[PDB]
Design a binder for these strands. Structure first.
Lengths: 66, 225, 88, 129, 70, 259, 156
RNA sequence: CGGCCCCCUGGACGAAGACUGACGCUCAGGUGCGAAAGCGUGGGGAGCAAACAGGAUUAGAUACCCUGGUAGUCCACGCCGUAAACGAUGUCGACUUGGAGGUUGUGCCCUUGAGGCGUGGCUUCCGGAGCUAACGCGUUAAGUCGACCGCCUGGGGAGUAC
């Protein structure tokens, strides 16, 4: 039950923070493709986006850090 | 004798799901509707007719037919079919080596008969309650297993079967001895052991009944002849 | 890889029809150019072994093509090797 | 790479026989066609049919007697690795005469017996039984 | 697993919640994993072995299930 | 001939996949198993509990016709998913009928809110609606005679996940689950959910528009460990459950049943 | 009318808590001096019983073999497990030139004249089986004609 | 071969077309790449840790366990050329029943929805015929064949001596 297949997105955006936030943990970790049911191709992209965000301090690497 | 329309009504044309099929049944399959295999009634019917004819012929020379169906849905029906044409049957679990190991099973049959006699003709009664109970239980067991075949005497001259994959042991036994086999063979089943294959729905009750009935009729006809 | 425009140019020059592209000579030229390009890369990056494998393969292919040309038609081959400046 | 077409054809035929295939198709060649014809004559196949102009496909129609296959065995003898040429006296007898040996002679491809009759040997293509 | 006790929330409940959070995180498990160095080979082996086991559980057992026990 | 080919496309034309065409004739009844034949490869093992109406006893003898459902084929041997869901489509059609004249009228009787909306029951089935839907104003049916007779006037429906809150009394008055997972959230919002499969540690009740709930084994009852959830509740049944916990991240909404 | 030859008898053991339980295997083969052959492999705690069992086995599940006069119809290979066997038809007078288990099977079958080598393994049980297989596969001229859609004179 | 980014760069696959026209397959010698450890010169050195030291354990404990700990692991440029370098399965091509997946394209179809019907590439598991000493392999063969190469000929002595 993938979101990105239905939406039909060409590429996942690191700037689209809200969207990312659904796929990240309360502890900051990226959520598995088993749980979200994201398609494999998209999942990787999502992960990449998240990573990018983390570099730009848009998303946090973890809950504890400060 | 049996028409196509009737068969259709019954649900002969329906088969098993596509993932459970046997590719040796690819000739007898027509297509796949809703991911479920459809048996070709154009190829089935003539074969069925032929089988029926063969059965009739067998009957005519005073052949002993054995009706096998241990599905538990069509156990009641097969017995009925057998009894209509006063032939023999195995409606509960086929004992491994019933035919191949007849000589041992002949003893069992004899025992059963004896038990029956004791129960009925003796009219002695006066038996220890536990022992009596045990005896009764034994009788029940025997009846369930070998009730249809108690009057068979020797081996049957033909073997009618409701499911080939389910009764493969029986089929195998019939091949080892060389008894003609008349199996109803759904898409999941293997037709290679069967002599007179009948492509049709083993599972559906109405279809099974239909299959039985015609066969019974043919046997009766043969007997009459 | 070789840029599209460059490839096209190469095809036009060596190819008789210019739409042809698959002419032996044209192919050789294409290979040769690529090899030349990669020389620069490999001067810089001596440990890039994986990449160099591809280059080697290309070279081999070119050689094969040349050989083929030679048996078929000598004059053409000679011309080609004058144009490209292939010692053999 | 494809090195021996006749051999390949033979293999295909064998596989068809094994797997109870009605007809066996392959890319056509003149030699192959000849072989097929020979087989037909000798009665190991039902019929052969070449079809196409640019790249034609030979289609053999295999034979089955009493369930089992007709071509019991079919081996190449000559092969690209190691060629076999026999003189008319040295020509073999496959299955003590019951099978046939396809032999290519100066007067076309024929069965071994035929070759013998003619009075000429040649390259031994395949045994068929 | 950062948590804040809600207004008029019991202590025990809060504790339970915290525990749950921890479990979700898989923090303890992670710690256990990083206690000692696992050779790459060993890691690989476990993963594949585990996968195999899972597969066995899924399919073979399912096949068994089709047939009744008594 | 092509008699059979034409007959095949004919029989394709005169059946469909869902429980739509009321076709299976009940050809054997035995407690506790009904069985039909809707022109499928095999006969359904129907429960008796998809067919007793509103007080517990059976309603349909031999020959009677209800459609079932489909799109799932062969688990080993057999054919269907249950006809009772069939019924849901009919309910949906009646609810939809409202749209035409902007007023669906039956009877709705809603005594109380498990999760903030009185429960309304139509015919055999009972549904849960959001808190406003029960009353047109602030009237509140707590002062009304218990389990009172009105109809239902619809207040709110969730259109994906099936929750419908309907309007008792006042006759005169006339990606996708996981972003905004804050609706049934706040601590204990009770839900009505059908269980799906009980995995010997769990029960998997999951209804609210493409989510997954567990109610695993610890609550379920008021005994902890010896319980074995197959004994204690059901298979395929709409129950009392509420959230107790949502993680919108590792999609594990952990519902409960001891409440 | 049937002739029956016990090829081999072999003692085989089963280890148990106490020690070794011994038993005997008997490999026999029977034939009517014409096409019909059948081998039987019987097992029992005592030899004679085992032999009897083997004989019984043999007598059922026989097999027919097309024999051109006293000999085979063409050279035939037969394999089974380790034992791979070649046997070749031979002129009247030559006798059964064959070794061991193989010989016995031939004799009962009523082949009088063969040239037969057993390559590979010579484990009696396997080799007899191989021989049987070879015999079985061997087709006659008539049979071949039937197969091919021809007369016997066309094939020669 | 695993954070993220950029620059240079090799291969694979699909979609249609268009072109070249057997240019192919395999390969003794030859050439290159080739984990880890190891070597050389120059850097670096957190953690880990051969060696080493102490503390235990023990009959002993030149080990396992504990506390420390140096080469090394890291980088640059050279050398080494071996591993259960394994799928213990040479490369290339053709042919022979099926099922359940994964991954990555792509054509059509009302995408009426996460779908429906195909068609390509790579890939995991199960299993048929056949094959196999059996175990098992089974369209990714260990089946049926062809082309080329490599290699084996009882165990030890020995992959050692010269």
């Amino acid at each position: 039950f993938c979101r990105f297949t239905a939406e039909g997105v060409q590429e996942i955006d690191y700037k689209d923070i809200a969207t990312l936030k659904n796929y990240i943990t309360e502890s900051g970790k990226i959520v598995p493709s088993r749980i979200t049911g994201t398609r494999a191709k998209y999942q990787r992209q999502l992960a990449r986006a998240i990573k990018r965000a983390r570099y730009l301090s848009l998303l946090p690497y973890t809950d504890r850090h400060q | 004798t049996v028409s196509m329309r009737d068969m259709l009504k019954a649900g002969v044309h329906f088969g098993h799901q596509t993932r459970y099929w046997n590719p040796k049944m690819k000739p007898f399959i027509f297509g796949a509707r809703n991911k479920v295999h459809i048996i070709n009634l154009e190829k089935t019917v003539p074969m069925f007719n032929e089988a029926l004819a063969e059965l009739n012929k067998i009957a005519s020379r005073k052949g002993k037919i054995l009706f096998v169906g241990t599905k538990r849905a069509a156990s009641e029906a097969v017995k009925d079919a057998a009894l209509s044409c006063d032939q023999f049957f195995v409606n509960h679990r086929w004992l491994g080596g019933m035919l191949t190991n007849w000589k041992t099973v002949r003893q069992s049959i004899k025992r059963l008969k004896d038990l029956e006699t004791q129960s009925q003709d003796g009219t002695f009664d006066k038996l220890t309650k536990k022992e009596a109970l045990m005896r009764t239980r034994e009788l029940e067991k025997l009846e369930n297993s070998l009730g249809g075949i108690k009057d068979m005497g020797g081996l049957p001259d033909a073997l009618f079967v409701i499911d080939a994959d389910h009764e493969h042991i029986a089929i195998k036994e019939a091949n080892n001895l060389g008894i003609p086999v008349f199996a109803i063979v759904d898409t999941n089943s293997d037709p290679d052991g069967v002599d007179f294959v009948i492509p049709g729905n083993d599972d559906a009750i109405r279809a099974v009944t239909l299959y039985l009935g015609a066969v019974a009729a043919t046997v009766r006809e043969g007997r009459s002849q | 890889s070789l840029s599209t425009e460059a490839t096209a140019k190469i095809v036009s020059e060596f190819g008789r029809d210019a739409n042809d592209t698959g002419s032996t000579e044209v192919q050789v030229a294409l290979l040769t150019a690529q090899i030349n390009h990669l020389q620069g890369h490999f001067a810089e990056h001596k440990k890039d072994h994986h990449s160099r494998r591809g280059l080697l393969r290309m070279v081999s292919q070119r050689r094969k093509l040349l050989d083929y040309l030679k048996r078929k038609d000598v004059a053409r081959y000679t011309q080609l090797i004058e144009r490209l400046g292939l010692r053999r | 790479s494809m090195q021996d077409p006749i051999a390949d054809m033979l293999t295909r035929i064998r596989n068809g026989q094994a797997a109870n295939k009605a007809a066996v198709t392959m890319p056509s060649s003149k030699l192959k066609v000849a072989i097929a014809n020979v087989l037909k004559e000798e009665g190991f196949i039902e019929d052969f049919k070449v079809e196409g102009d640019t790249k034609p496909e030979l289609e053999l129609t295999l034979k089955y007697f009493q369930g089992k296959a007709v071509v019991e065995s079919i081996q190449r003898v000559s092969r690209p690795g190691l060629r076999i040429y026999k003189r008319k006296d040295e020509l073999p007898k496959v299955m003590a005469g019951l099978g046939i040996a396809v032999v290519s002679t100066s007067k076309g491809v024929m069965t071994d017996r035929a070759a013998r009759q003619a009075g000429l040997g040649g390259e031994i293509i395949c045994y068929v039984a | 697993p950062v948590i804040k006790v809600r207004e008029n929330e019991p202590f025990d409940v809060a504790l339970r919640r915290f525990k749950r959070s921890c479990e979700k995180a898989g923090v303890l498990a992670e710690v256990r994993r990083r206690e000692f160095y696992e050779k790459p080979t060993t890691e690989r082996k476990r993963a594949k072995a585990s996968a195999v086991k899972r597969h066995a559980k899924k399919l073979a057992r399912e096949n068994a299930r089709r047939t009744r026990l008594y | 001939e092509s008699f059979a080919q034409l007959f095949e496309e004919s029989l394709k034309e005169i059946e469909t996949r869902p429980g739509s065409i009321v076709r299976g004739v009940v050809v054997a009844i035995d407690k506790d198993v009904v069985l039909v034949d809707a022109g499928l490869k095999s006969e359904s093992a129907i429960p008796a509990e998809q067919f007793k109406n509103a007080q517990g006893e059976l309603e349909i003898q031999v020959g009677d016709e209800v459609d079932v459902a489909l799109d799932a084929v062969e688990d080993g041997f057999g054919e269907t998913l249950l006809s009772r869901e069939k019924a849901k489509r009919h309910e949906a059609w009646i609810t939809l009928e409202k749209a035409y004249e902007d007023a669906e009228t039956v009877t709705g009787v809603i005594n109380g809110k498990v999760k903030g909306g009185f429960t309304v029951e139509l015919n055999g089935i009972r549904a849960f609606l959001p808190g406003s839907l029960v009353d047109v104003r602030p009237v509140r049916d707590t002062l009304h005679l218990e389990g009172k007779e009105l109809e239902f006037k619809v207040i709110k429906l969730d259109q994906k996940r099936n929750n419908v809150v309907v309007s008792r009394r006042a006759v005169i008055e006339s990606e996708d689950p996981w972003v905004a997972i804050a609706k049934r959230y706040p601590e204990g919002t009770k839900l009505t959910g059908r269980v799906t499969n009980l995995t010997d540690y769990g029960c998997f009740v999951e209804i609210e528009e493409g989510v997954e709930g567990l109610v695993h084994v610890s609550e379920m009852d008021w005994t902890n460990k010896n319980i074995h959830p197959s004994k204690v509740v059901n298979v395929g049944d709409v129950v009392e459950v509420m959230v107790l916990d949502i993680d919108e991240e590792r999609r594990r909404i952990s519902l409960g049943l001891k409440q | 009318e049937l002739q029956e030859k016990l090829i081999a008898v072999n003692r085989v053991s089963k280890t148990v808590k106490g020690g070794r339980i011994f038993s005997f295997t008997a490999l026999t083969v029977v034939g009517d001096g014409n096409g019909r052959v059948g081998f039987g492999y019987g097992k029992a705690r005592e030899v004679p019983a085992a032999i009897q069992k083997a004989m019984e086995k043999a007598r059922r599940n026989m097999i027919n073999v097309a024999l051109n006069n006293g000999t085979l119809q063409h050279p035939v290979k037969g394999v089974h497990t380790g034992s791979r066997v070649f046997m070749q038809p031979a002129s009247e007078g030559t006798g059964i030139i064959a070794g061991g288990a193989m010989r016995a099977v031939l004799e009962v079958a009523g082949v009088h004249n063969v040239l037969a080598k057993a390559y590979g393994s010579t484990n009696p049980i396997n080799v007899v089986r191989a021989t049987i297989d070879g015999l079985e596969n061997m087709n006659s001229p008539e049979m071949v004609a039937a197969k091919r859609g021809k007369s016997v004179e066309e094939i020669l």
